[PDB]
């Protein structure tokens, strides 16, 4: 393991312990532990190129000498998820990970003609709480959220 310099735009610089085979996705998690920015609010760039979460640091030509930029996003960007209901059908919903679980239940509510208090949502077996942000449950593009009656 070796250390990498991270510079936050309009922010502080700092280092993180990293590996060559480590992914940008894991790096963001290291950054979150260091400065508390949730991974889903982090956009990383190296030399004006925005980094894809699946890329490995070595594949990107990173070493102890490199420096990566961090841009923190107050409001995040849209992604699609699947919400599979009691009937077993999955429909596409659009969310921002910085939105609350609540905004999603309201979308489900309006669209599927049900009251918010008549169902609840889970992701990977974990129940989703109305006031928490969707990102905190590790939602990713086309992941499946389950709707329970």
PDB file of N, CA and C in Angstrom, residues 26-101:
ATOM      1  N   UNK A  26     -13.356   2.500  -4.590  1.00  0.00           N
ATOM      2  CA  UNK A  26     -12.813   2.259  -3.257  1.00  0.00           C
ATOM      3  C   UNK A  26     -12.106   3.519  -2.743  1.00  0.00           C
ATOM      4  N   UNK A  27     -11.505   4.269  -3.661  1.00  0.00           N
ATOM      5  CA  UNK A  27     -10.784   5.472  -3.291  1.00  0.00           C
ATOM      6  C   UNK A  27     -11.726   6.494  -2.694  1.00  0.00           C
ATOM      7  N   UNK A  28     -12.895   6.647  -3.309  1.00  0.00           N
ATOM      8  CA  UNK A  28     -13.884   7.581  -2.800  1.00  0.00           C
ATOM      9  C   UNK A  28     -14.295   7.217  -1.371  1.00  0.00           C
ATOM     10  N   UNK A  29     -14.369   5.915  -1.095  1.00  0.00           N
ATOM     11  CA  UNK A  29     -14.711   5.424   0.229  1.00  0.00           C
ATOM     12  C   UNK A  29     -13.595   5.749   1.213  1.00  0.00           C
ATOM     13  N   UNK A  30     -12.354   5.701   0.742  1.00  0.00           N
ATOM     14  CA  UNK A  30     -11.223   6.104   1.568  1.00  0.00           C
ATOM     15  C   UNK A  30     -11.309   7.600   1.867  1.00  0.00           C
ATOM     16  N   UNK A  31     -11.692   8.379   0.860  1.00  0.00           N
ATOM     17  CA  UNK A  31     -11.847   9.827   0.992  1.00  0.00           C
ATOM     18  C   UNK A  31     -12.959  10.181   1.970  1.00  0.00           C
ATOM     19  N   UNK A  32     -14.056   9.434   1.908  1.00  0.00           N
ATOM     20  CA  UNK A  32     -15.175   9.641   2.825  1.00  0.00           C
ATOM     21  C   UNK A  32     -14.749   9.427   4.289  1.00  0.00           C
ATOM     22  N   UNK A  33     -13.980   8.370   4.528  1.00  0.00           N
ATOM     23  CA  UNK A  33     -13.493   8.059   5.866  1.00  0.00           C
ATOM     24  C   UNK A  33     -12.571   9.185   6.337  1.00  0.00           C
ATOM     25  N   UNK A  34     -11.851   9.797   5.405  1.00  0.00           N
ATOM     26  CA  UNK A  34     -10.860  10.803   5.767  1.00  0.00           C
ATOM     27  C   UNK A  34     -11.481  12.161   6.090  1.00  0.00           C
ATOM     28  N   UNK A  35     -12.437  12.594   5.270  1.00  0.00           N
ATOM     29  CA  UNK A  35     -12.986  13.937   5.402  1.00  0.00           C
ATOM     30  C   UNK A  35     -14.500  13.936   5.534  1.00  0.00           C
ATOM     31  N   UNK A  36     -15.104  12.757   5.496  1.00  0.00           N
ATOM     32  CA  UNK A  36     -16.526  12.643   5.746  1.00  0.00           C
ATOM     33  C   UNK A  36     -17.460  12.997   4.586  1.00  0.00           C
ATOM     34  N   UNK A  37     -16.935  13.210   3.379  1.00  0.00           N
ATOM     35  CA  UNK A  37     -17.817  13.422   2.216  1.00  0.00           C
ATOM     36  C   UNK A  37     -18.286  12.056   1.748  1.00  0.00           C
ATOM     37  N   UNK A  38     -19.601  11.829   1.740  1.00  0.00           N
ATOM     38  CA  UNK A  38     -20.130  10.547   1.232  1.00  0.00           C
ATOM     39  C   UNK A  38     -19.625  10.277  -0.198  1.00  0.00           C
ATOM     40  N   UNK A  39     -19.307   9.026  -0.521  1.00  0.00           N
ATOM     41  CA  UNK A  39     -18.764   8.695  -1.838  1.00  0.00           C
ATOM     42  C   UNK A  39     -19.650   9.209  -2.975  1.00  0.00           C
ATOM     43  N   UNK A  40     -20.966   9.114  -2.816  1.00  0.00           N
ATOM     44  CA  UNK A  40     -21.888   9.546  -3.881  1.00  0.00           C
ATOM     45  C   UNK A  40     -21.918  11.055  -4.106  1.00  0.00           C
ATOM     46  N   UNK A  41     -21.197  11.816  -3.284  1.00  0.00           N
ATOM     47  CA  UNK A  41     -21.120  13.266  -3.485  1.00  0.00           C
ATOM     48  C   UNK A  41     -19.766  13.645  -4.053  1.00  0.00           C
ATOM     49  N   UNK A  42     -18.935  12.638  -4.327  1.00  0.00           N
ATOM     50  CA  UNK A  42     -17.561  12.848  -4.796  1.00  0.00           C
ATOM     51  C   UNK A  42     -17.403  12.630  -6.312  1.00  0.00           C
ATOM     52  N   UNK A  43     -16.900  13.641  -7.011  1.00  0.00           N
ATOM     53  CA  UNK A  43     -16.393  13.475  -8.372  1.00  0.00           C
ATOM     54  C   UNK A  43     -14.860  13.655  -8.423  1.00  0.00           C
ATOM     55  N   UNK A  44     -14.134  12.625  -8.845  1.00  0.00           N
ATOM     56  CA  UNK A  44     -12.673  12.705  -8.925  1.00  0.00           C
ATOM     57  C   UNK A  44     -12.184  12.948 -10.363  1.00  0.00           C
ATOM     58  N   UNK A  45     -11.116  13.733 -10.505  1.00  0.00           N
ATOM     59  CA  UNK A  45     -10.507  13.981 -11.807  1.00  0.00           C
ATOM     60  C   UNK A  45      -8.986  13.937 -11.719  1.00  0.00           C
ATOM     61  N   UNK A  46      -8.362  13.431 -12.779  1.00  0.00           N
ATOM     62  CA  UNK A  46      -6.920  13.489 -12.949  1.00  0.00           C
ATOM     63  C   UNK A  46      -6.588  14.169 -14.278  1.00  0.00           C
ATOM     64  N   UNK A  47      -5.946  15.331 -14.218  1.00  0.00           N
ATOM     65  CA  UNK A  47      -5.569  16.064 -15.425  1.00  0.00           C
ATOM     66  C   UNK A  47      -6.744  16.324 -16.369  1.00  0.00           C
ATOM     67  N   UNK A  48      -7.806  16.910 -15.821  1.00  0.00           N
ATOM     68  CA  UNK A  48      -9.008  17.290 -16.569  1.00  0.00           C
ATOM     69  C   UNK A  48      -9.866  16.119 -17.054  1.00  0.00           C
ATOM     70  N   UNK A  49      -9.461  14.889 -16.749  1.00  0.00           N
ATOM     71  CA  UNK A  49     -10.253  13.719 -17.116  1.00  0.00           C
ATOM     72  C   UNK A  49     -10.993  13.230 -15.877  1.00  0.00           C
ATOM     73  N   UNK A  50     -12.319  13.198 -15.943  1.00  0.00           N
ATOM     74  CA  UNK A  50     -13.115  12.671 -14.841  1.00  0.00           C
ATOM     75  C   UNK A  50     -12.984  11.151 -14.769  1.00  0.00           C
ATOM     76  N   UNK A  51     -12.832  10.639 -13.551  1.00  0.00           N
ATOM     77  CA  UNK A  51     -12.554   9.226 -13.330  1.00  0.00           C
ATOM     78  C   UNK A  51     -13.795   8.370 -13.138  1.00  0.00           C
ATOM     79  N   UNK A  52     -13.798   7.210 -13.790  1.00  0.00           N
ATOM     80  CA  UNK A  52     -14.894   6.251 -13.710  1.00  0.00           C
ATOM     81  C   UNK A  52     -14.669   5.369 -12.476  1.00  0.00           C
ATOM     82  N   UNK A  53     -15.731   5.072 -11.742  1.00  0.00           N
ATOM     83  CA  UNK A  53     -15.598   4.319 -10.489  1.00  0.00           C
ATOM     84  C   UNK A  53     -14.917   2.960 -10.612  1.00  0.00           C
ATOM     85  N   UNK A  54     -14.984   2.351 -11.789  1.00  0.00           N
ATOM     86  CA  UNK A  54     -14.446   1.015 -11.974  1.00  0.00           C
ATOM     87  C   UNK A  54     -12.983   0.966 -12.339  1.00  0.00           C
ATOM     88  N   UNK A  55     -12.391   2.131 -12.577  1.00  0.00           N
ATOM     89  CA  UNK A  55     -11.008   2.175 -13.023  1.00  0.00           C
ATOM     90  C   UNK A  55     -10.083   1.884 -11.856  1.00  0.00           C
ATOM     91  N   UNK A  56      -8.973   1.220 -12.147  1.00  0.00           N
ATOM     92  CA  UNK A  56      -7.955   0.969 -11.138  1.00  0.00           C
ATOM     93  C   UNK A  56      -6.937   2.092 -11.191  1.00  0.00           C
ATOM     94  N   UNK A  57      -6.349   2.412 -10.042  1.00  0.00           N
ATOM     95  CA  UNK A  57      -5.442   3.547  -9.946  1.00  0.00           C
ATOM     96  C   UNK A  57      -4.219   3.375 -10.845  1.00  0.00           C
ATOM     97  N   UNK A  58      -3.671   2.167 -10.891  1.00  0.00           N
ATOM     98  CA  UNK A  58      -2.528   1.890 -11.753  1.00  0.00           C
ATOM     99  C   UNK A  58      -2.882   1.979 -13.248  1.00  0.00           C
ATOM    100  N   UNK A  59      -4.070   1.508 -13.623  1.00  0.00           N
ATOM    101  CA  UNK A  59      -4.503   1.607 -15.016  1.00  0.00           C
ATOM    102  C   UNK A  59      -4.583   3.080 -15.407  1.00  0.00           C
ATOM    103  N   UNK A  60      -4.739   3.948 -14.409  1.00  0.00           N
ATOM    104  CA  UNK A  60      -4.834   5.380 -14.667  1.00  0.00           C
ATOM    105  C   UNK A  60      -3.470   6.048 -14.591  1.00  0.00           C
ATOM    106  N   UNK A  61      -2.434   5.240 -14.399  1.00  0.00           N
ATOM    107  CA  UNK A  61      -1.075   5.742 -14.289  1.00  0.00           C
ATOM    108  C   UNK A  61      -0.791   6.538 -13.019  1.00  0.00           C
ATOM    109  N   UNK A  62      -1.434   6.160 -11.914  1.00  0.00           N
ATOM    110  CA  UNK A  62      -1.227   6.843 -10.633  1.00  0.00           C
ATOM    111  C   UNK A  62      -0.155   6.176  -9.783  1.00  0.00           C
ATOM    112  N   UNK A  63       0.621   7.010  -9.106  1.00  0.00           N
ATOM    113  CA  UNK A  63       1.669   6.555  -8.217  1.00  0.00           C
ATOM    114  C   UNK A  63       1.797   7.533  -7.071  1.00  0.00           C
ATOM    115  N   UNK A  64       2.758   7.290  -6.166  1.00  0.00           N
ATOM    116  CA  UNK A  64       3.004   8.170  -5.017  1.00  0.00           C
ATOM    117  C   UNK A  64       3.195   9.632  -5.430  1.00  0.00           C
ATOM    118  N   UNK A  65       3.582   9.846  -6.684  1.00  0.00           N
ATOM    119  CA  UNK A  65       3.844  11.181  -7.218  1.00  0.00           C
ATOM    120  C   UNK A  65       2.604  11.920  -7.742  1.00  0.00           C
ATOM    121  N   UNK A  66       1.540  11.185  -8.041  1.00  0.00           N
ATOM    122  CA  UNK A  66       0.390  11.775  -8.714  1.00  0.00           C
ATOM    123  C   UNK A  66      -0.456  12.630  -7.768  1.00  0.00           C
ATOM    124  N   UNK A  67      -1.328  13.449  -8.347  1.00  0.00           N
ATOM    125  CA  UNK A  67      -2.293  14.219  -7.570  1.00  0.00           C
ATOM    126  C   UNK A  67      -3.673  14.201  -8.238  1.00  0.00           C
ATOM    127  N   UNK A  68      -4.700  13.818  -7.481  1.00  0.00           N
ATOM    128  CA  UNK A  68      -6.073  13.788  -7.993  1.00  0.00           C
ATOM    129  C   UNK A  68      -6.927  14.885  -7.366  1.00  0.00           C
ATOM    130  N   UNK A  69      -7.808  15.475  -8.171  1.00  0.00           N
ATOM    131  CA  UNK A  69      -8.698  16.531  -7.695  1.00  0.00           C
ATOM    132  C   UNK A  69     -10.056  16.001  -7.240  1.00  0.00           C
ATOM    133  N   UNK A  70     -10.558  16.565  -6.148  1.00  0.00           N
ATOM    134  CA  UNK A  70     -11.872  16.197  -5.653  1.00  0.00           C
ATOM    135  C   UNK A  70     -12.820  17.384  -5.762  1.00  0.00           C
ATOM    136  N   UNK A  71     -13.959  17.146  -6.394  1.00  0.00           N
ATOM    137  CA  UNK A  71     -15.021  18.129  -6.471  1.00  0.00           C
ATOM    138  C   UNK A  71     -16.194  17.540  -5.708  1.00  0.00           C
ATOM    139  N   UNK A  72     -16.668  18.301  -4.736  1.00  0.00           N
ATOM    140  CA  UNK A  72     -17.729  17.872  -3.850  1.00  0.00           C
ATOM    141  C   UNK A  72     -19.026  18.456  -4.379  1.00  0.00           C
ATOM    142  N   UNK A  73     -20.095  17.675  -4.413  1.00  0.00           N
ATOM    143  CA  UNK A  73     -21.289  18.131  -5.105  1.00  0.00           C
ATOM    144  C   UNK A  73     -22.413  18.307  -4.104  1.00  0.00           C
ATOM    145  N   UNK A  74     -22.883  19.539  -3.943  1.00  0.00           N
ATOM    146  CA  UNK A  74     -23.985  19.804  -3.025  1.00  0.00           C
ATOM    147  C   UNK A  74     -25.223  19.037  -3.451  1.00  0.00           C
ATOM    148  N   UNK A  75     -25.747  19.353  -4.632  1.00  0.00           N
ATOM    149  CA  UNK A  75     -26.755  18.515  -5.282  1.00  0.00           C
ATOM    150  C   UNK A  75     -26.082  17.558  -6.282  1.00  0.00           C
ATOM    151  N   UNK A  76     -26.419  16.275  -6.232  1.00  0.00           N
ATOM    152  CA  UNK A  76     -25.790  15.301  -7.118  1.00  0.00           C
ATOM    153  C   UNK A  76     -26.579  15.156  -8.437  1.00  0.00           C
ATOM    154  N   UNK A  77     -26.102  14.291  -9.330  1.00  0.00           N
ATOM    155  CA  UNK A  77     -26.699  14.137 -10.664  1.00  0.00           C
ATOM    156  C   UNK A  77     -27.601  12.915 -10.782  1.00  0.00           C
ATOM    157  N   UNK A  78     -28.526  12.959 -11.736  1.00  0.00           N
ATOM    158  CA  UNK A  78     -29.514  11.881 -11.782  1.00  0.00           C
ATOM    159  C   UNK A  78     -28.969  10.516 -12.184  1.00  0.00           C
ATOM    160  N   UNK A  79     -29.616   9.482 -11.642  1.00  0.00           N
ATOM    161  CA  UNK A  79     -29.369   8.100 -12.009  1.00  0.00           C
ATOM    162  C   UNK A  79     -30.711   7.359 -11.985  1.00  0.00           C
ATOM    163  N   UNK A  80     -30.780   6.215 -12.670  1.00  0.00           N
ATOM    164  CA  UNK A  80     -32.002   5.420 -12.717  1.00  0.00           C
ATOM    165  C   UNK A  80     -31.890   4.207 -11.816  1.00  0.00           C
ATOM    166  N   UNK A  81     -32.989   3.863 -11.165  1.00  0.00           N
ATOM    167  CA  UNK A  81     -33.032   2.655 -10.360  1.00  0.00           C
ATOM    168  C   UNK A  81     -34.272   1.861 -10.772  1.00  0.00           C
ATOM    169  N   UNK A  82     -34.357   0.620 -10.315  1.00  0.00           N
ATOM    170  CA  UNK A  82     -35.560  -0.162 -10.487  1.00  0.00           C
ATOM    171  C   UNK A  82     -36.228  -0.298  -9.127  1.00  0.00           C
ATOM    172  N   UNK A  83     -37.527  -0.027  -9.065  1.00  0.00           N
ATOM    173  CA  UNK A  83     -38.290  -0.314  -7.864  1.00  0.00           C
ATOM    174  C   UNK A  83     -39.211  -1.490  -8.162  1.00  0.00           C
ATOM    175  N   UNK A  84     -38.932  -2.646  -7.567  1.00  0.00           N
ATOM    176  CA  UNK A  84     -39.785  -3.797  -7.796  1.00  0.00           C
ATOM    177  C   UNK A  84     -40.846  -3.915  -6.705  1.00  0.00           C
ATOM    178  N   UNK A  85     -42.112  -3.941  -7.120  1.00  0.00           N
ATOM    179  CA  UNK A  85     -43.224  -3.950  -6.175  1.00  0.00           C
ATOM    180  C   UNK A  85     -43.642  -5.344  -5.707  1.00  0.00           C
ATOM    181  N   UNK A  86     -44.722  -5.370  -4.938  1.00  0.00           N
ATOM    182  CA  UNK A  86     -45.266  -6.598  -4.382  1.00  0.00           C
ATOM    183  C   UNK A  86     -45.662  -7.598  -5.460  1.00  0.00           C
ATOM    184  N   UNK A  87     -46.130  -7.080  -6.591  1.00  0.00           N
ATOM    185  CA  UNK A  87     -46.578  -7.927  -7.690  1.00  0.00           C
ATOM    186  C   UNK A  87     -45.424  -8.577  -8.439  1.00  0.00           C
ATOM    187  N   UNK A  88     -44.207  -8.114  -8.177  1.00  0.00           N
ATOM    188  CA  UNK A  88     -43.041  -8.686  -8.822  1.00  0.00           C
ATOM    189  C   UNK A  88     -42.576  -7.926 -10.048  1.00  0.00           C
ATOM    190  N   UNK A  89     -43.241  -6.813 -10.347  1.00  0.00           N
ATOM    191  CA  UNK A  89     -42.897  -6.001 -11.512  1.00  0.00           C
ATOM    192  C   UNK A  89     -41.897  -4.910 -11.120  1.00  0.00           C
ATOM    193  N   UNK A  90     -40.873  -4.682 -11.942  1.00  0.00           N
ATOM    194  CA  UNK A  90     -39.921  -3.592 -11.687  1.00  0.00           C
ATOM    195  C   UNK A  90     -40.122  -2.432 -12.656  1.00  0.00           C
ATOM    196  N   UNK A  91     -40.182  -1.214 -12.126  1.00  0.00           N
ATOM    197  CA  UNK A  91     -40.293  -0.020 -12.962  1.00  0.00           C
ATOM    198  C   UNK A  91     -39.105   0.918 -12.742  1.00  0.00           C
ATOM    199  N   UNK A  92     -38.774   1.688 -13.775  1.00  0.00           N
ATOM    200  CA  UNK A  92     -37.631   2.575 -13.709  1.00  0.00           C
ATOM    201  C   UNK A  92     -38.030   3.869 -13.003  1.00  0.00           C
ATOM    202  N   UNK A  93     -37.231   4.247 -12.012  1.00  0.00           N
ATOM    203  CA  UNK A  93     -37.402   5.527 -11.336  1.00  0.00           C
ATOM    204  C   UNK A  93     -36.100   6.327 -11.421  1.00  0.00           C
ATOM    205  N   UNK A  94     -36.225   7.646 -11.547  1.00  0.00           N
ATOM    206  CA  UNK A  94     -35.079   8.545 -11.541  1.00  0.00           C
ATOM    207  C   UNK A  94     -34.916   9.280 -10.203  1.00  0.00           C
ATOM    208  N   UNK A  95     -33.705   9.271  -9.666  1.00  0.00           N
ATOM    209  CA  UNK A  95     -33.460   9.910  -8.377  1.00  0.00           C
ATOM    210  C   UNK A  95     -32.128  10.629  -8.407  1.00  0.00           C
ATOM    211  N   UNK A  96     -31.909  11.460  -7.393  1.00  0.00           N
ATOM    212  CA  UNK A  96     -30.588  12.019  -7.109  1.00  0.00           C
ATOM    213  C   UNK A  96     -30.209  11.430  -5.764  1.00  0.00           C
ATOM    214  N   UNK A  97     -28.993  10.920  -5.613  1.00  0.00           N
ATOM    215  CA  UNK A  97     -28.626  10.286  -4.342  1.00  0.00           C
ATOM    216  C   UNK A  97     -28.645  11.245  -3.142  1.00  0.00           C
ATOM    217  N   UNK A  98     -28.642  12.553  -3.401  1.00  0.00           N
ATOM    218  CA  UNK A  98     -28.705  13.553  -2.327  1.00  0.00           C
ATOM    219  C   UNK A  98     -30.157  13.895  -1.976  1.00  0.00           C
ATOM    220  N   UNK A  99     -31.102  13.179  -2.575  1.00  0.00           N
ATOM    221  CA  UNK A  99     -32.508  13.323  -2.190  1.00  0.00           C
ATOM    222  C   UNK A  99     -32.827  12.360  -1.077  1.00  0.00           C
ATOM    223  N   UNK A 100     -33.880  12.652  -0.326  1.00  0.00           N
ATOM    224  CA  UNK A 100     -34.249  11.769   0.766  1.00  0.00           C
ATOM    225  C   UNK A 100     -35.038  10.587   0.257  1.00  0.00           C
ATOM    226  N   UNK A 101     -35.045   9.522   1.049  1.00  0.00           N
ATOM    227  CA  UNK A 101     -35.887   8.371   0.797  1.00  0.00           C
ATOM    228  C   UNK A 101     -37.303   8.876   0.548  1.00  0.00           C
TER     229      UNK A 101
END
